[PDB]
Design an enzyme around this catalytic site. Structure first.
Site, mmCIF file in Angstrom:
data_model
loop_
_atom_site.group_PDB
_atom_site.id
_atom_site.type_symbol
_atom_site.label_atom_id
_atom_site.label_comp_id
_atom_site.label_asym_id
_atom_site.label_seq_id
_atom_site.Cartn_x
_atom_site.Cartn_y
_atom_site.Cartn_z
ATOM 1 N N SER A 45 0.831 -1.223 0.000
ATOM 2 C CA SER A 45 0.000 0.000 0.000
ATOM 3 C C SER A 45 0.847 1.247 0.000
ATOM 4 O O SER A 45 0.312 2.356 -0.206
ATOM 5 C CB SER A 45 -0.919 0.074 1.194
ATOM 6 N N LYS A 48 0.665 3.975 -2.784
ATOM 7 C CA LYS A 48 -0.373 5.025 -2.840
ATOM 8 C C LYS A 48 0.149 6.442 -2.577
ATOM 9 O O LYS A 48 -0.454 7.421 -3.008
ATOM 10 C CB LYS A 48 -1.448 4.738 -1.790
ATOM 11 N N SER A 105 -6.324 3.512 3.618
ATOM 12 C CA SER A 105 -5.879 2.356 2.804
ATOM 13 C C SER A 105 -7.025 1.821 1.958
ATOM 14 O O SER A 105 -7.157 0.602 1.726
ATOM 15 C CB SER A 105 -5.247 1.257 3.709
ATOM 16 N N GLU A 141 -4.940 -2.846 -7.383
ATOM 17 C CA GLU A 141 -5.399 -3.400 -6.099
ATOM 18 C C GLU A 141 -6.396 -4.543 -6.355
ATOM 19 O O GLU A 141 -7.242 -4.396 -7.235
ATOM 20 C CB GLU A 141 -6.061 -2.306 -5.265
ATOM 21 N N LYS A 209 2.890 5.924 5.721
ATOM 22 C CA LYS A 209 1.911 5.054 5.021
ATOM 23 C C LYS A 209 2.440 3.649 5.183
ATOM 24 O O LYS A 209 3.613 3.394 4.913
ATOM 25 C CB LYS A 209 1.793 5.356 3.511
ATOM 26 N N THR A 210 1.556 2.757 5.633
ATOM 27 C CA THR A 210 1.962 1.374 5.845
ATOM 28 C C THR A 210 1.375 0.493 4.733
ATOM 29 O O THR A 210 0.564 0.922 3.867
ATOM 30 C CB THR A 210 1.475 0.773 7.184
ATOM 31 N N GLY A 211 1.848 -0.758 4.713
ATOM 32 C CA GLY A 211 1.366 -1.740 3.735
ATOM 33 C C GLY A 211 1.622 -3.152 4.212
ATOM 34 O O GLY A 211 2.486 -3.376 5.067
ATOM 35 N N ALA A 212 0.889 -4.096 3.639
ATOM 36 C CA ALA A 212 1.088 -5.500 3.953
ATOM 37 C C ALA A 212 0.764 -6.327 2.717
ATOM 38 O O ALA A 212 0.189 -5.855 1.720
ATOM 39 C CB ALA A 212 0.202 -5.949 5.155
HETATM 40 C C1 LIG Z 1 -2.044 -1.327 2.686
HETATM 41 O O1 LIG Z 1 -2.453 -0.282 3.184
HETATM 42 C C2 LIG Z 1 -2.466 -2.545 3.048
HETATM 43 C C3 LIG Z 1 -2.192 -3.636 2.305
HETATM 44 C C4 LIG Z 1 -2.771 -4.685 2.915
HETATM 45 C C5 LIG Z 1 -2.795 -6.011 2.617
HETATM 46 C C6 LIG Z 1 -3.487 -6.895 3.452
HETATM 47 C C7 LIG Z 1 -4.132 -6.445 4.604
HETATM 48 C C8 LIG Z 1 -4.083 -5.088 4.935
HETATM 49 N N1 LIG Z 1 -3.363 -4.239 4.055
HETATM 50 C C9 LIG Z 1 -3.181 -2.895 4.142
HETATM 51 N N2 LIG Z 1 -3.652 -2.089 5.141
HETATM 52 C C10 LIG Z 1 -3.312 -2.259 6.557
HETATM 53 C C11 LIG Z 1 -1.844 -1.912 6.822
HETATM 54 O O2 LIG Z 1 -1.385 -2.274 7.924
HETATM 55 O O3 LIG Z 1 -1.252 -1.256 5.942
HETATM 56 C C12 LIG Z 1 -4.251 -1.374 7.419
HETATM 57 C C13 LIG Z 1 -3.818 0.109 7.404
HETATM 58 C C14 LIG Z 1 -4.322 -1.874 8.860
HETATM 59 O O4 LIG Z 1 -4.292 -3.288 8.874
HETATM 60 C C15 LIG Z 1 -4.812 -3.821 10.019
HETATM 61 O O5 LIG Z 1 -4.634 -3.253 11.105
HETATM 62 N N3 LIG Z 1 -5.494 -4.980 9.948
HETATM 63 C C16 LIG Z 1 -5.734 -5.691 8.669
HETATM 64 C C17 LIG Z 1 -5.102 -7.094 8.716
HETATM 65 N N4 LIG Z 1 -3.881 -7.190 7.892
HETATM 66 S S1 LIG Z 1 -6.024 -1.506 6.684
HETATM 67 O O6 LIG Z 1 -6.955 -0.840 7.728
HETATM 68 O O7 LIG Z 1 -6.387 -3.012 6.565
#
Ligand SMILES: *C(=O)c1cc2ccccn2c1N[C@@H](C(=O)O)[C@](C)(COC(=O)NCCN)S(=O)O
Ligand SMILES: OC[C@H]1O[C@H](O[C@H]2[C@H](O)[C@@H](O)[C@H](OCCCCCCC3CCCCC3)O[C@@H]2CO)[C@H](O)[C@@H](O)[C@@H]1O
Length: 265
Positions: A45, A48, A105, A141, A209-212
């Site tokens: 993420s 973005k 996000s 996305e 800005k975070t991502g996963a």
């Molecule tokens: C990018 O923003 C992003 C990418 C992914 C992929 C999978 C799950 C969540 N995300 C995100 N957003 C989260 C992030 O940490 O970047 C987020 C801001 C917060 O995530 C959580 O706290 N819980 C979701 C479980 N992974 S968003 O509100 O979900």
């Protein structure tokens, strides 16, 4: 905490994954800490922020307005649309879509924006135009979070991401108002930002800005500094670890703790 570099090594050891990290003075671009800074990591993420930099460049050029209202359909929505799913009837402005993408996000907001800039190819072309010859967006996305091992799609490097963020925020490639707007969207993160403040010592500035992603991918692009100033850009990516989300978060926090305790390098 240990020195930043020693903590980064301890994080790879504990996670069994690759960490990529840069710490850079925001004003000058001085690199202070670099670890695997030329290796590729999925942006997830974090892309973005770059996306919205390309939007703002279009607004500066008279080709876009942050006011312009975009209307979309339920069939346009992808997974995780906390703001955009609420405006099927009335739409969202371009500026609102960027707030939603960066601060909540929102993935459909990000894809709507991505369409305005010419898709993954268009954003990659924009990156090439600001002199980033490494970072690439290939997918939309939420496929861009797939983080397949060894797959170059949707990646940056820590060094490339730090340089590009610095360019967007400070190089006068964007107008003054646009640099200010990009910064404020990062300051306004609704999720990780407030939690991070809650554990930062008093006087520390945060914007982020975070991502996963899959396979343990996790990252943050941030501005950080004492004396309530955005002194440094800190970019941290994780990939290829089987660890829980909580442990990946703790390791990233750990690297931050190391930077804070050992700030004057
Ligand atoms: C990018 O923003 C992003 C990418 C992914 C992929 C999978 C799950 C969540 N995300 C995100 N957003 C989260 C992030 O940490 O970047 C987020 C801001 C917060 O995530 C959580 O706290 N819980 C979701 C479980 N992974 S968003 O509100 O979900
Ligand atoms: O001596 C410096 C400081 O040492 C401690 O502060 C701890 C703090 O109590 C803890 O909550 C935090 O965790 C780090 C939290 C960072 C969370 C994410 C950081 C971001 C920033 C951008 C890059 C990575 C992610 O570490 C610091 C430094 O040890 C003391 O609590 C504090 O009073 C003192 O001013």
């Amino acid at each position: 905490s240990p020195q930043p570099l020693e903590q980064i090594k301890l994080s790879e050891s504990q996670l069994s994954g690759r960490v990529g990290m840069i710490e850079m003075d925001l004003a000058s671009g001085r690199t202070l800490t670099a670890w695997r800074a030329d290796e590729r990591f999925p942006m997830m993420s974090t892309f973005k922020v770059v996306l919205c930099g390309a939007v703002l460049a279009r607004v500066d050029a008279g080709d876009e307005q942050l006011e312009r209202k975009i209307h979309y359909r339920q069939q346009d929505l992808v997974d995780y649309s906390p703001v955009s799913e609420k405006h099927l009837a009335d739409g969202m402005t371009v500026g609102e879509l960027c707030a939603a993408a960066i601060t909540m996000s929102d993935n459909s907001a990000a894809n709507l924006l991505l369409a305005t800039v010419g898709g993954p190819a268009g954003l990659t072309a924009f990156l090439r135009q600001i002199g980033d010859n490494v970072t690439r967006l290939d997918r939309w996305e939420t496929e861009l979070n797939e983080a397949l091992p060894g797959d170059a799609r949707d990646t940056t490097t820590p060094a490339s991401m730090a340089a590009t963020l610095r360019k967007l925020l400070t190089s006068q490639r964007l107008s003054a108002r646009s640099q200010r707007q990009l910064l404020q969207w990062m300051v306004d993160d609704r999720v990780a930002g407030p939690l991070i403040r809650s554990v930062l010592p008093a006087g520390w500035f945060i914007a982020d800005k975070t991502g996963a992603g899959e396979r343990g991918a996790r990252g943050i692009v941030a501005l950080l500094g004492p004396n309530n100033k955005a002194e440094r850009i800190v970019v941290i990516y994780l990939r290829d670890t089987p660890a829980s989300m909580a442990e990946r978060n703790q390791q990233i926090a750990g690297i931050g703790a190391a930077l804070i305790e050992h700030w004057q390098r």
